[PDB]
Amino acid sequence: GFTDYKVADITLAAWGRRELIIAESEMPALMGLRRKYAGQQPLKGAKILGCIHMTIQTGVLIETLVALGAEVRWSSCNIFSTQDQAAAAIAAAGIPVFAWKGETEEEYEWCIEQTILKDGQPWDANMVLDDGGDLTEILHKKYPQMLERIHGITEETTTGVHRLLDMLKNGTLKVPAINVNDSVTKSKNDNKYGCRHSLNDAIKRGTDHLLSGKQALVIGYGDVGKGSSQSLRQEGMIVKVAEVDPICAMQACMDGFEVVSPYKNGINDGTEASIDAALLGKIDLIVTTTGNVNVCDANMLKALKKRAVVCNIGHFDNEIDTAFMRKNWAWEEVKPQVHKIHRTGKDGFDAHNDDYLILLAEGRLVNLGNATGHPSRIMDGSFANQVLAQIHLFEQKYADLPAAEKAKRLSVEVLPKKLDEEVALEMVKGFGGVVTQLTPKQAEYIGVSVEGPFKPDTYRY
Amino acid sequence: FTDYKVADITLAAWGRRELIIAESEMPALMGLRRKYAGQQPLKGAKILGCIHMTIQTGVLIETLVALGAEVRWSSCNIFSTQDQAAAAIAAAGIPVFAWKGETEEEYEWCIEQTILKDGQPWDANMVLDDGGDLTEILHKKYPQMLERIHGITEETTTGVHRLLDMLKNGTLKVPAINVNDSVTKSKNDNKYGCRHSLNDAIKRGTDHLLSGKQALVIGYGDVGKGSSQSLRQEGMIVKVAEVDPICAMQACMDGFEVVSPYKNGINDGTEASIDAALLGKIDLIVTTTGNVNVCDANMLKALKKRAVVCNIGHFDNEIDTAFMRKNWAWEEVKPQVHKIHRTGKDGFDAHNDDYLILLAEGRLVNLGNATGHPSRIMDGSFANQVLAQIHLFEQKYADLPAAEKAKRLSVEVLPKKLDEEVALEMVKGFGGVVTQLTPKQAEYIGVSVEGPFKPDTYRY
Amino acid sequence: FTDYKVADITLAAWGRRELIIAESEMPALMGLRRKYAGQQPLKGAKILGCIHMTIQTGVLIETLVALGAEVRWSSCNIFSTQDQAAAAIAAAGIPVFAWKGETEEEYEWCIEQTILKDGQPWDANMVLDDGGDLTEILHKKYPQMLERIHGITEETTTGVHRLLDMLKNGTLKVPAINVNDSVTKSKNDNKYGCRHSLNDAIKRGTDHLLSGKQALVIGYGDVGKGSSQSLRQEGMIVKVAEVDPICAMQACMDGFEVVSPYKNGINDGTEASIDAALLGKIDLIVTTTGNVNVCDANMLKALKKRAVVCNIGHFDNEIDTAFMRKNWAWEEVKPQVHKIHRTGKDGFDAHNDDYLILLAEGRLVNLGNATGHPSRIMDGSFANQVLAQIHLFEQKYADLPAAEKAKRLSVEVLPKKLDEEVALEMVKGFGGVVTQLTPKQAEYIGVSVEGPFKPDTYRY
Amino acid sequence: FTDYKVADITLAAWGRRELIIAESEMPALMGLRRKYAGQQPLKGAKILGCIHMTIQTGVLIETLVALGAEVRWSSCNIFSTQDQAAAAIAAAGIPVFAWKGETEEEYEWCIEQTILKDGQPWDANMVLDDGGDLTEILHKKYPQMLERIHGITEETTTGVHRLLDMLKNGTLKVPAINVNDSVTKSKNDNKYGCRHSLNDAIKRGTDHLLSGKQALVIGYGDVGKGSSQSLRQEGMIVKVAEVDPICAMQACMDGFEVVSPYKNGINDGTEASIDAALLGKIDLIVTTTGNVNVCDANMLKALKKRAVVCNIGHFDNEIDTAFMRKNWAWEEVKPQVHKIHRTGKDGFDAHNDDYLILLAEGRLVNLGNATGHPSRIMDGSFANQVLAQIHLFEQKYADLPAAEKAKRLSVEVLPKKLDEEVALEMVKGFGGVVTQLTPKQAEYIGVSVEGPFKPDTYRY
Ligand SMILES: NC(=O)c1ccc[n+]([C@@H]2O[C@H](COP(=O)([O-])OP(=O)(O)OC[C@H]3O[C@@H](n4cnc5c(N)ncnc54)[C@H](O)[C@@H]3O)[C@@H](O)[C@H]2O)c1
Ligand SMILES: NC(=O)c1ccc[n+]([C@@H]2O[C@H](COP(=O)([O-])OP(=O)(O)OC[C@H]3O[C@@H](n4cnc5c(N)ncnc54)[C@H](O)[C@@H]3O)[C@@H](O)[C@H]2O)c1
Ligand SMILES: NC(=O)c1ccc[n+]([C@@H]2O[C@H](COP(=O)([O-])OP(=O)(O)OC[C@H]3O[C@@H](n4cnc5c(N)ncnc54)[C@H](O)[C@@H]3O)[C@@H](O)[C@H]2O)c1
Ligand SMILES: NC(=O)c1ccc[n+]([C@@H]2O[C@H](COP(=O)([O-])OP(=O)(O)OC[C@H]3O[C@@H](n4cnc5c(N)ncnc54)[C@H](O)[C@@H]3O)[C@@H](O)[C@H]2O)c1
Ligand SMILES: Nc1ncnc2[nH]cnc12
Ligand SMILES: Nc1ncnc2[nH]cnc12
Ligand SMILES: Nc1ncnc2[nH]cnc12
Ligand SMILES: [Zn+2]
C-alpha cells in the first residue's frame, strides 16, 4: 500500500538493500547504538524532519533512527548527492523520502516541502536533522508554528552550524541545537579523512585523469582543505595551498605544501591585473574547500591553464563563480556531472577547441556529485553522533518546557566529550584496534577517571 | 664577569656563530625584537628562566634582554644543554648555570644559582619555566619570593598540568600563561618538532637503519603524532598504543595499527598479561605520554633482543629505568647510549646478544642525543613566550590591590589574534603568501578582514 | 552491413568527446601522429589487434590508422571494454568486436571476427596483442595466416613469457617485439598505472574505506610495487608476499612487512600449512604475480570474514575462483561485484556474515571495476606500440625466403634511444624541462649530448 | 704492531663496541663469515683496499681477514673515516692508514702506504676499490704490481665508469667485478642508503628545519631518487633536474616537478641563461650526478641567500668550489660546515646576510657530515664485495698464460643467484618470510624453485 515518496526508480530497491547490508557491516558505532537502544526505544514518539544527502550511509542512519522508535520524512540536501538505489531502498521500507540524483532547484525545494507537509498540512514534526541549514531556514521563515512543537535541531556540517550561530546571535533561533560537526569523531574524521578518500575518487570517476606529476591548487586548509590536499598529494600531485588564516597556512607549510595566493601579494583589487597569471597558468586542478563565497572567481577562471579541472568540495556551489561561466561561456556536457566550459564565447563552440575548462558537478560538492561521498566506515562516526544528538534533544523536550526554562536551554551546544569518546571506541574496535586501560595510579597521575573522559575540553587533538 | 657556570667558556665563539644562523631561522622572534625595541616593555623585568639551554633558547634569552629584561638561567633537563649555546650566553654577560651531562645534584644546584644572587634571593619578578620544576621549587622552598613575582609563563604540556593542579587546589600564588596551548606552540613544536628531531636523535645515537623495522609508539597526542610520523616517513612499520579512543581513532585513520602491550589492554602488573608475541617483534619503542611507567619492567623483559628504547616525553619516569639499574648491567657505548644486558646485574659478556639499547638514560631523547627541535619551529613557541612575558610583566600582578589580584589569579592562554600574528611571521619565513579576504567575503563568513578567523572552539 | 559488433552504437558521441580529451593527455602518441603523417609508415599494414577496448586503446587505434594502417580489433578481456570507446571506434568505420561483459564464447567469437573478414581469412600482415590470446589462436587455428604476417608487438609481461616459451620450443612462426620491457612501458604502466587504478577500482566496486585496514599484496614486481603503493598511500597497513628475495628486499626497504600465507613459507597443500592467524586479520588481498593459484582455496577459507579479494595480474587463475564456484554461493551485488557465501553451495541467507567480496570475478580488477590506467600513462605504452609496429612492418619478415625466416625469428626490445624519445615527450606533457649536457659533461660521463644516456645494463 | 696511521689509537675500544653492534645489523656479511670460515677461501689473498674507513667497512675488513685474507687499507675520501673504526682496525693488527680530515697530500700518502710495505711494493694480489683512485695509481705508477693481481672489485658507479673507460681504451690490466650493479648494491645502497643518510647529514651540519622549504636535487639516478625521497619525506618541496628523459619521467610520476637551472635547459655558460627566479627560491641544492660542474658558478651566484649547498656524488667537482675559494670568503662554523660570503674574497662581516652554507667542502655529505649509510644497508654491498673477492681470487687470472688472460679480461657482474642469496639474508634480518614456490608454480613461470627468479634483462 505505501506510496508516500518520490524517487527515480523504485525497482533499484533490491540493489540498495544489498548495499545497505554491506554498509551495516562497515558502521559499527551506528549499529552498536541500534543494538544498545533497541529495547529502550528512546526515540518512540519522535517525528524527525531530515535533510541530508540520500546516500547508502544516510540509509543506515535513517533505519537506526526508525529502529529506535522514530518516524521520519526525508529529503536530500543537494541536487546531485542522492544515490537512487539508496532512496529506492528507503521508500521500499515504508519510509517517506523525496530525493533523486539530478534534481532541479525547483524540485529540490519541493522535496523539502514534502517532508514538512503531510497530506497538504504541516506534519506533526518534533525534531529536525539538517546538513547545511536549508530545512532549518525554511522552518524559521515559513513554518514558525511548527517550530513551537520542535524540541531541537541536530546540524551536521560546518556551514549549517555557522548559520545557526548567526540566528542565535540575532535572537531569531527558535529551538535549541546540537552542533554535531564539532564532535572530534565528526570534524576530525568525516571532514578531513572523508575528503581524503572521496576527492581523488570523484576526480578519477569524472575525468579519469592521471593526477601524479600534475599541479594542483587547493583553496582553504581547514578540515576539508587538509583532507583534500592529502587526497591529491598522496596520488603524487604537486599541491599548492591558499589560505586567509595564517595558522592554517602555517600548518600547510609544515605539512610540506607551498602556500600561495591567486592574487599578487594576496590582494584582490577586483581587476584582472591583480591575478597571479603566471601561477594560475600552470595549475591543472583547482579545488575549493572554504565554505566562503567566490574563492574561485571570474578573473581566476579566465587565467587558469587551458584544460584545467575545476571543482568544489565545500557545501555550496557559490565558492566558484559558475554564474559568470553560464553567462559568458559555452557548456559542452561530456557525461553527467562533467562539463567542458569553452572560453571562446557563449553561443556554441568548436568540438576541437583547446581553450576550455572541465567543471565537475556544476560546482556542487564534487565527492557526492561525481562519486558516492565519504565511505561508510567514516560516516559511522558522524552518524553515531547524530543519533546521540537526536536522543539528547528529544529527551530534553524543549517544546514542552515553560517559558522561563526554555530561556535557559536555548543554545547551540556540542555533545559531551564522554560520548565522543564512546563513538571513537566503537570506531577503533571496528579496525581491530586495542586501546590500553589506564592503571589506577596512571589515571590518578594524569587526573582522569579510568573510563574517561581523557582530555580537558580545551584539547584540540 | 664570573657569575655563571658552563662546561667550557671557549665554545662561545662557535655558539655565537650558531646564534647568528638561528636568528635567520627565527623571523617571529626577530620581528618582536624590531617591533618592541623602542618601547622596552621588559625594562625592569628580572626573569628566572628554566628551559633547555640550546641555541634556540639563546635566541629567546637575547630577545628578552633586547626588550629590557635581565635574566638568570638554567636548563630544565640534565642532558639538553648545548654547551656552545651556554658558553655564548655566559660570554655575553648573562648568568647561566647549565651543561650537558649534569648529575641530579648539579641540576638542582643550577636552579638554585638562578634563584640566589650573591648568596641571597635575587629580586626576581617573572618566571619562565618548561616542565614546572622551577615553579615547584619557588612555591615549596621560596614562597616569599612569589609575593614579588608578576607571573609565570609555562612552556610544556607537563608543566601546564602541574599549574592547573595547583590552581584547582588553591596553591598557585601568581597568575600564569599556558604558552603550550597557543596553536603556534602545541600544533607546531609538540608535533612537527618531534617529527624533525626523533628520527634525528635515534640516528645520531645508534646509526640504525629504520626502514623496514617495527616500532611501537606509546601515545598519540601531539608528541605521539609527530613521533609516529618521524618513524613512518623513514619506512618504519609503526604500531601505536593509546588509552584515549579519540586519539586511537586518529592513529587508525592515519594508517597505523593500534595495539596494546597488554593482552586485551589490561595491565594488571603481571608478566602473564604482557603480549609477549607483539613485544618480541618490536625493534624500537618510543614513549610520548607525559604519564608514568608506560614502558614498564615486564614490557622491557619481553622486548625483542637488541631493541632500542627511548622517551620523548618531558620526564624519564615514562620508562622503568630504575628497574633496569637495579637488575641489569649497563655498558656505555658512547655518551647517552647504553647497552643494557638482561643477563644479570654484575658484569656482562662483551659479546652477549641479549641486551636493549637505551638512549639518553630515558631522558627526552631529541635533546639528549641530538639538538631538539629546529630553530624555525622553536621560533613559534618562543615568540609566544616573549609575548606572554610582556603581557604578565605589564599587568604587574604583584602590585595590584587585593580585590584585583583575586580576579586575575588564573591560568590563561594568549589571545587568538596574537597566535595568528606569530603564525603569519612563520608563514612569511617560508615565503608563503596569505590571501586577504574581500569585504564581501569577510561579511559572508562573519569575520573581520584582519582576523581572528576562527572561533575559540576551533581545533585546527 | 555493419562490420562491427558493440553493445550500443548510441554511445559513440560520448566516446568521441572522451577521445578528444584523451588526445590532450597523450602527447607522445599525438606527437607520433604528427611526425609520421607525411611518411605514412604503416601504409599497407593490416593489423589484427587484441587489447582492452578502452578510450586509451581508441587513441592507439586512431594513431595506427592516421599513419596508414587498416585494423580489425577485439578486446583481450571479457570485462575491460569501455562501451563508449568501442562505439566511437565503430562509428569511425573501424571494425571492432567488443563489449563489456562478454561470455567466454563471445570473447572467442570477437577474436575470430577480427581474423576473418566476410567469412574468409583477412589479408592481415601485422599483430598487436596484450596477453597472447590472439597470438595463440593464430598459431593453433590459422597457421597459414602467419606466412603473411611480418610480426607481433606484445604489450604485457604474461604475453612476453608466452612468446619466449614458443621461441624456446620452436613453435613461434613470426618475430616479435617485447613492448613491455621499454622503461616507458614496464616502469610506467605496470607500476604507476596500477598505483592509479587499483584503489580506483576497489572504491568503485565497494566504496570501502581503505585507511586503517589490513591488506595483503601477493607479489612485488612492477604491478605489485604499484599496487602496494596504491593501498599504502590511502593509509592501508600493507603486507607483501614474494618468492623472489630481491623483490622482497625492496618491499622491506620500502616500508612493508614481508609475510607468507603459509607457515615458514611452505605450502603442503593442506589447511594445516596456512597461517590462519595472519589471514584472519586481512581485509583485502590483491594478486599481482602472473602466476597460478597464488590465492588458493585454503587461503580463501582462512581469510577474515568480509575480506575483499581481487586480482590485477593478466589472468584470473591467480585466484582459485573455480573452487569458489564449485563450493560456495555467489550473490551479485552489482555488475562485477559478488559476495561469495562460505556457508555452502545451494543458496545463502541474505544476512549471512561469512562471505568474501570478489571483484570482477577474479579478472583484472582495474579494468573490470574501473577504467584501467589513465591516458597520460598509457601514452608511453602506446607510443612504444606504434614504434614497434613501424619497425616490424618496415622489416618485412614475411617476404623473406624460407631459409632466411628461420634465422630471423627473435623476440627483441626497442632501442634505448626511442625509449628516451618517448620519455621526453611524456616529461614535456607535465611541463618538465630536461637539461642539456655541455660537451665537456657529455665527454666526462662518456655519452653523446643527444643520448642514449645509460648503458643497456642500466635498471633505472 | 706499528704498521698503521690513525688519528687516535685510544678510540679503539669505542670502535670495537660499535663493530659488535654493527655485526648484529649485518646478517648477510656475518652469514658469509660463518659459512666460509672453515674453507678459508681467501687464504693467500693479499688485498689492497681503498674505501671509506667506517664502522661498516670495519666489518667488511674483518670478514675478509676471517676468510684468510691479509689486507692493507686506506679511505677513499678525506672526510669519510670514522676515527673509532680506524682505531679498532689498527688495534686488531691490521694495516690501516686513514683519519677524518686528511689533506690531499695525506690522502695520497695513505694510499701509498697500502701499496708499499717497508719501502717496497707489497706482494698484493687483489684490489678492492671505491671510486677508482687506487686503481688509477696502480695502472699509472705501479704497472708491475698489476702483473701479479688477479682482480679488482669496484664498489661505486663512478669507479665502474672509470674501469669501463680503461677497458674500451685497452688499458685495463686485470679483470674486474662491477659490485655496484648487483641489485642488492645499486638498488639498496645507492638509493635507500642516501634516503637514510642525506637528511641525517644536513641535520647534523645545520640543524635546519627541512619541512616547508624548497629543494633542488640535481640528478635522478639511484642516488638522486634516494636523495629526493630523503628530502620529500621530511616535507621539503623538491624539484628535480635531469639530462636523462627516462629518469625525468620517473621523477614526474613520483610526484616531483622537473626543472632546469637553465632557460630551456640550455647551459651555454652565460649568467643570463640562469633561471634566476627558480634559483632565488631554493633553500637547499644537492648534487647526485657523478658528473662535473652541475652546480656551477652562475648557479651559486643566483641561489637564494643562506641556501645550503651539498654534494652526495662521489667527487667534489660536481660543485664549483674552486670558484668559491677564488672569489668568496669562507667562515668555518664548525668542522665540515662553512659559510661562504658572497660579498668578496678578503674578510667578511660576521653579520652579513649574503652567504651560502657549504657542507663538507663539497665532498660526499652523508659521510662527511654524518656516518654514511647504515650497517643494515651496507650489509648488502659488502656481502657482494666478499663474494666478488672470492670469485676473482679463485679464478687466479695472474697465473693464466697471456692467450688465456685475453678471454677473461672483462668487467663483469656477479650471477643473479648470488644477488638473490644476499637479498634473502637481508630479508631474514627484517624478519621477512619469503614464500617457496610449489613445483607446479615454478614450472608455470619457467624457473627453478630455488631461483633465479628473473631473466637477466629484469630491471626490478
Ligand atoms: N563535501 C563534503 O563531504 C564535506 C564534508 C565536511 C564539510 N564540508 C563543507 O566544506 C566546507 C569547509 O568545511 P571545514 O570543516 O573545512 O571548514 P573550516 O572552517 O575548518 O575551513 C575552511 C577554511 O577556508 C579558509 N578560507 C576562507 N576563505 C578563504 C579564501 N578566500 N581563500 C582561502 N582560504 C579561505 C578558512 O580560513 C578556513 O581555514 C564547509 O562548507 C563544510 O560544510 C563538506
Ligand atoms: N621532547 C620534546 O621536545 C617535547 C615537546 C613537546 C612536549 N613534550 C612533552 O611530551 C609529553 C607529551 O606531550 P603532548 O603534548 O603530546 O601531550 P598530550 O596530552 O597531547 O598527549 C599524551 C598522550 O598520551 C596518552 N597516554 C597517556 N597514558 C598512556 C598510556 N599508558 N598508554 C598509551 N597512551 C597513553 C594520552 O591519551 C594522550 O593522548 C609531555 O610530557 C610534554 O611535556 C616534549
Ligand atoms: N592490470 C594491469 O593493468 C596490468 C598492468 C601491467 C601488467 N599486468 C600483468 O600483471 C602481472 C604481473 O606483471 P609484472 O610486470 O609485475 O611482472 P613481474 O614479473 O615484474 O612481477 C611478478 C612478481 O610475482 C612474484 N611472484 C610469483 N609467484 C609468486 C608467489 N607464488 N607468491 C608471491 N609472489 C610471487 C614474482 O617473484 C615477481 O616478482 C602479469 O600478468 C602482467 O601481464 C597487468
Ligand atoms: N654518497 C654515497 O653514499 C653514494 C652512494 C652510491 C653512489 N654514490 C655516487 O653518486 C653518484 C651518482 O651515482 P648513481 O648510482 O646515482 O648514478 P646514476 O648513473 O644512476 O645517476 C646519475 C644521474 O645523474 C644524471 N645527470 C648527469 N649529468 C647531469 C646534469 N648535468 N644535470 C642533471 N642530471 C644529470 C644522469 O642522467 C643520471 O640519471 C656517483 O658518483 C656514485 O659513485 C654515492
Ligand atoms: N556518504 C555520505 N552520506 C551522507 N552525507 C555525506 N557527507 C559526505 N559523504 C556523505
Ligand atoms: N631546541 C630546543 N630548545 C629549547 N626547547 C626545546 N624543546 C624542544 N626542542 C627545544
Ligand atoms: N657507511 C659506509 N661505509 C662505507 N662505504 C659507504 N658508502 C656509503 N656509506 C658507507
Ligand atoms: Zn547538506
Side-chain angles (χ1 to χ4, degrees), chain A residues 135-150:
Chain A
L135 165 63
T136 296
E137 178 65 13
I138 290 158
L139 290 171
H140 280 79
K141 293 288 189 180
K142 269 204 66 154
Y143 301 98
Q145 188 165 46
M146 292 185 69
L147 284 167
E148 299 197 348
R149 292 308 305 141
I150 287 164

Short mmCIF file of all heavy atoms in Angstrom, two decimals, chain A residues 135-150:
data_model
loop_
_atom_site.label_atom_id
_atom_site.label_comp_id
_atom_site.label_asym_id
_atom_site.label_seq_id
_atom_site.Cartn_x
_atom_site.Cartn_y
_atom_site.Cartn_z
N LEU A 135 16.75 23.34 5.42
CA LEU A 135 15.49 22.96 6.04
C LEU A 135 15.20 23.89 7.27
O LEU A 135 14.07 24.37 7.50
CB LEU A 135 15.53 21.48 6.44
CG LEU A 135 14.49 20.96 7.41
CD1 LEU A 135 13.09 21.08 6.83
CD2 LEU A 135 14.76 19.49 7.83
N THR A 136 16.24 24.09 8.07
CA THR A 136 16.17 24.97 9.26
C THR A 136 15.70 26.38 8.87
O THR A 136 14.81 26.98 9.52
CB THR A 136 17.54 25.00 9.95
OG1 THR A 136 17.85 23.68 10.44
CG2 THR A 136 17.55 26.00 11.10
N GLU A 137 16.26 26.89 7.77
CA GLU A 137 15.87 28.21 7.27
C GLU A 137 14.40 28.26 6.83
O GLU A 137 13.68 29.20 7.19
CB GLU A 137 16.78 28.61 6.13
CG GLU A 137 16.47 29.97 5.47
CD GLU A 137 16.67 31.17 6.33
OE1 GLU A 137 17.27 31.07 7.42
OE2 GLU A 137 16.20 32.24 5.86
N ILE A 138 13.96 27.24 6.11
CA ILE A 138 12.56 27.19 5.64
C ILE A 138 11.59 27.13 6.82
O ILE A 138 10.58 27.85 6.86
CB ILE A 138 12.33 26.01 4.66
CG1 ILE A 138 13.04 26.32 3.35
CG2 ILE A 138 10.85 25.79 4.38
CD1 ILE A 138 13.35 25.10 2.51
N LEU A 139 11.91 26.29 7.81
CA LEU A 139 11.07 26.21 9.00
C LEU A 139 10.95 27.58 9.69
O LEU A 139 9.84 28.03 10.05
CB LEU A 139 11.59 25.15 9.97
CG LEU A 139 11.39 23.72 9.44
CD1 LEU A 139 12.12 22.73 10.36
CD2 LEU A 139 9.91 23.32 9.39
N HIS A 140 12.07 28.28 9.88
CA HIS A 140 12.04 29.56 10.58
C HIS A 140 11.29 30.64 9.78
O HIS A 140 10.55 31.45 10.39
CB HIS A 140 13.44 30.03 10.92
CG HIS A 140 14.01 29.35 12.14
ND1 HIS A 140 14.53 28.06 12.12
CD2 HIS A 140 14.10 29.78 13.41
CE1 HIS A 140 14.94 27.74 13.33
NE2 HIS A 140 14.69 28.76 14.13
N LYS A 141 11.46 30.63 8.47
CA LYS A 141 10.88 31.70 7.64
C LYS A 141 9.41 31.46 7.31
O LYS A 141 8.64 32.42 7.27
CB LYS A 141 11.69 31.92 6.36
CG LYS A 141 13.08 32.49 6.65
CD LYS A 141 13.09 33.93 7.09
CE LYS A 141 14.50 34.47 7.13
NZ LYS A 141 14.46 35.87 7.57
N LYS A 142 9.03 30.21 7.08
CA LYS A 142 7.72 29.86 6.57
C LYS A 142 6.83 29.09 7.54
O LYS A 142 5.61 29.14 7.39
CB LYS A 142 7.89 29.07 5.29
CG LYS A 142 7.93 29.83 3.99
CD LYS A 142 7.51 28.92 2.83
CE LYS A 142 6.05 28.47 2.90
NZ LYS A 142 5.55 28.16 1.55
N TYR A 143 7.39 28.38 8.50
CA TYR A 143 6.63 27.50 9.41
C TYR A 143 6.94 27.70 10.86
O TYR A 143 7.14 26.75 11.63
CB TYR A 143 6.88 26.02 9.01
CG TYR A 143 6.47 25.71 7.61
CD1 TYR A 143 7.38 25.68 6.57
CD2 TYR A 143 5.11 25.45 7.31
CE1 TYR A 143 6.97 25.38 5.27
CE2 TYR A 143 4.71 25.14 6.03
CZ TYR A 143 5.63 25.13 5.02
OH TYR A 143 5.19 24.87 3.77
N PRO A 144 6.91 28.97 11.32
CA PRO A 144 7.17 29.18 12.75
C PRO A 144 6.23 28.44 13.70
O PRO A 144 6.69 28.05 14.79
CB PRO A 144 7.02 30.73 12.91
CG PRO A 144 6.20 31.16 11.74
CD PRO A 144 6.63 30.25 10.63
N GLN A 145 4.98 28.18 13.31
CA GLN A 145 4.09 27.43 14.19
C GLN A 145 4.56 26.01 14.41
O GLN A 145 4.38 25.42 15.52
CB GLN A 145 2.60 27.40 13.77
CG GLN A 145 1.72 26.75 14.86
CD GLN A 145 0.24 27.00 14.73
OE1 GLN A 145 -0.32 26.88 13.65
NE2 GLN A 145 -0.38 27.35 15.81
N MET A 146 5.20 25.44 13.39
CA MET A 146 5.77 24.08 13.56
C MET A 146 6.92 24.10 14.55
O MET A 146 7.10 23.15 15.28
CB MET A 146 6.26 23.54 12.21
CG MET A 146 5.10 23.27 11.27
SD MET A 146 5.59 22.50 9.72
CE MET A 146 6.11 20.87 10.27
N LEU A 147 7.69 25.19 14.59
CA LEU A 147 8.87 25.22 15.48
C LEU A 147 8.44 25.29 16.93
O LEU A 147 9.19 24.87 17.78
CB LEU A 147 9.76 26.40 15.11
CG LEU A 147 10.59 26.17 13.85
CD1 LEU A 147 11.18 27.47 13.39
CD2 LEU A 147 11.74 25.17 14.09
N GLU A 148 7.20 25.71 17.22
CA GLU A 148 6.75 25.73 18.61
C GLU A 148 6.73 24.34 19.22
O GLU A 148 6.83 24.21 20.42
CB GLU A 148 5.30 26.27 18.73
CG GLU A 148 5.09 27.65 18.27
CD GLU A 148 3.78 28.26 18.78
OE1 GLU A 148 2.91 27.52 19.32
OE2 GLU A 148 3.58 29.47 18.59
N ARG A 149 6.56 23.31 18.36
CA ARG A 149 6.41 21.94 18.80
C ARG A 149 7.66 21.09 18.54
O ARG A 149 7.68 19.89 18.80
CB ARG A 149 5.16 21.32 18.13
CG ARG A 149 3.82 21.94 18.63
CD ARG A 149 3.61 21.99 20.17
NE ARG A 149 3.75 20.69 20.80
CZ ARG A 149 4.32 20.45 21.97
NH1 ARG A 149 4.75 21.44 22.76
NH2 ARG A 149 4.41 19.19 22.40
N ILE A 150 8.73 21.74 18.04
CA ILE A 150 10.01 21.07 17.78
C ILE A 150 10.96 21.20 18.96
O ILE A 150 11.19 22.30 19.51
CB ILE A 150 10.59 21.53 16.41
CG1 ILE A 150 9.74 20.90 15.27
CG2 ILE A 150 12.06 21.14 16.29
CD1 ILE A 150 9.96 21.58 13.93
#
